[PDB]
Design an enzyme around this catalytic site. Structure first.
Site, PDB file in Angstrom:
ATOM      1  N   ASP A   1     -54.649  -0.951  -2.768  1.00 22.51           N
ATOM      2  CA  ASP A   1     -54.066  -1.913  -3.546  1.00 22.51           C
ATOM      3  C   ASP A   1     -54.381  -1.964  -5.284  1.00 22.51           C
ATOM      4  OD1 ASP A   1     -52.633  -4.236  -3.953  1.00 22.51           O
ATOM      5  OD2 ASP A   1     -53.675  -5.264  -2.234  1.00 22.51           O
TER       6      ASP A   1
ATOM      7  N   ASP B   1     -45.090  -8.776  -3.111  1.00 22.57           N
ATOM      8  CA  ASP B   1     -45.232  -8.973  -1.728  1.00 22.57           C
ATOM      9  C   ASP B   1     -44.110  -9.737  -1.003  1.00 22.57           C
ATOM     10  OD1 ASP B   1     -47.773  -8.191  -2.276  1.00 22.57           O
ATOM     11  OD2 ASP B   1     -49.003  -9.841  -1.218  1.00 22.57           O
TER      12      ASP B   1
HETATM   13  O1  LIG Z   1     -55.116  -9.165  -0.043  1.00 24.21           O
HETATM   14  C1  LIG Z   1     -54.302  -8.477   0.868  1.00 24.21           C
HETATM   15  C2  LIG Z   1     -52.822  -8.309   0.158  1.00 24.21           C
HETATM   16  O2  LIG Z   1     -53.142  -7.796  -1.251  1.00 24.21           O
HETATM   17  C3  LIG Z   1     -51.988  -7.590  -2.044  1.00 24.21           C
HETATM   18  O3  LIG Z   1     -51.957  -7.009  -3.134  1.00 24.21           O
HETATM   19  C4  LIG Z   1     -50.750  -6.656  -0.846  1.00 24.21           C
HETATM   20  O4  LIG Z   1     -49.673  -6.366  -1.762  1.00 24.21           O
HETATM   21  C5  LIG Z   1     -50.467  -7.332   0.250  1.00 24.21           C
HETATM   22  O5  LIG Z   1     -49.636  -6.395   1.188  1.00 24.21           O
HETATM   23  C6  LIG Z   1     -51.988  -7.505   1.157  1.00 24.21           C
HETATM   24  O6  LIG Z   1     -52.585  -6.058   1.097  1.00 24.21           O
END
Ligand SMILES: OC[C@H]1O[C@@H](O)[C@H](O)[C@@H](O)[C@H]1O
Ligand SMILES: [Pt+2]
Length: 362
Positions: A130, A185
């Protein structure tokens, strides 16, 4: 990424879409059991990937990650052994920063080599990395550090980059990893799923064996969309050579959910040896046609009705890469039926639903 991994898009499961930060080792073990018992493992879903919230807030006195003493008391090594015994692989999650996005555990910035060595010693087979808490350091510096550590200490670890499409990863991430998130996301709703597909679509030309565009984890089975919307979601992700990471609780799937995720003909399109990302080729007032080449001169085609009413969609040979004089055998992947076709294929498509075919030239 030339590490011999990800020759085809990764297939598996990830704890985030349904469990978020509420994950534990019991859920992971049961999920592994479920992937096997439901037949999903046999179809190719091999990666059991743990997302955020698996470690202790702080590293130990040696500077190593510590599996959460409350939710992962048995440790990651033991969990990896469990999954490996089932013929599966285990994935883990970290962050190119000081802490993960949940701010509940450390990130690997300045600990890349040590963390990769730790993961390898635990038997980890996949890493999602991430982009939160970047400490004011560049995307390229932070990811380059982990790429180097992986190529030296984690040669058998699939490297999934997760920096939400920042700085157009499709144009460079392939030299650093096996797949890269191209968007923000995904959420379990129609607007999110469709927009992720559209945004990911512009990078189709950059995808190929060893490096895939990642429009995010599948939401199929989480309840926020209809069966038709999920069928389109799965079909498009498959056609686009997107990673196929299940995001629902596979331990309690409905038959409808299982049926969508278990379509081996659709999976075969995603896992095609040619490894070309299918893309949008027709878009008329919400009625779209997506297509791409497959092995042995075949074509994959999806008719997607993004309107709220029943409508006829027609895929024209000229738009899907075939000369008008090419007769083929069309295979309806969801109806599991074959028929003769040439010039074009027209079909009545239900609202938000789709039709998917594989065309095999005579
Ligand atoms: O906190 C967990 C969350 O973090 C975000 O940055 C990601 O894009 C998600 O897919 C997940 O991994
Ligand atoms: Pt780079």
């Amino acid at each position: 990424f030339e590490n011999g991994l990800g020759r085809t898009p990764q297939m598996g499961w990830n704890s985030w879409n349904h469990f978020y930060c509420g994950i534990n080792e019991q859920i992971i073990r049961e999920t592994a059991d479920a992937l096997v018992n439901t037949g999903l493992a046999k179809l190719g879903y091999q990666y059991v990937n743990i997302d955020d919230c698996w470690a202790e807030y702080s590293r130990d006195s040696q500077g190593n990650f510590v599996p959460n003493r409350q939710t992962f008391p048995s440790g990651i090594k033991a969990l990896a052994d469990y999954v490996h015994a089932k013929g599966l692989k285990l994935g883990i999650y970290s962050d190119a920063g000081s802490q993960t996005c949940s701010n509940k555990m450390p990130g690997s910035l300045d600990h890349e080599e040590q963390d990769v060595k730790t993961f390898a010693s635990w038997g980890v087979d996949y890493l999602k990395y991430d982009n939160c808490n970047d400490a004011g350091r560049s995307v390229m510096e932070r990811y380059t550090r982990m790429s180097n550590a992986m190529k030296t200490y984690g040669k058998n670890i699939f490297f999934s980059l997760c920096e939400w499409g920042k700085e157009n990863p499709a144009t460079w991430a392939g030299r650093m990893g096996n797949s890269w998130r191209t968007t923000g996301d995904i959420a379990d709703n129609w607007g999110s799923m469709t927009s992720r597909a559209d945004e990911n679509d512009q990078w189709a030309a950059y995808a190929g064996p060893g490096g895939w565009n990642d429009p995010d984890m599948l939401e199929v089975g989480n309840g926020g969309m209809s069966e038709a919307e999920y069928r389109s979601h799965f079909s498009i992700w498959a056609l686009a050579k997107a990673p196929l990471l299940i995001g629902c609780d596979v331990r309690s799937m409905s038959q409808q959910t299982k049926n969508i995720l278990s379509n081996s003909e659709v999976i075969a399109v995603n896992q095609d040896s040619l490894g070309v990302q299918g893309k949008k080729v027709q878009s008329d007032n919400g009625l779209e046609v997506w297509a791409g080449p497959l092995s042995n001169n075949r074509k994959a085609v999806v008719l997607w009705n993004r309107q709220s009413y029943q409508a006829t969609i027609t895929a024209h040979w000229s738009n899907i890469g075939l000369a008008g004089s090419v007769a083929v055998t069309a295979r309806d992947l969801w109806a599991h039926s074959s028929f003769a076709a040439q010039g074009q294929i027209s079909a009545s498509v239900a609202p938000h639903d789709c039709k998917m075919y594989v065309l095999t030239p005579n």
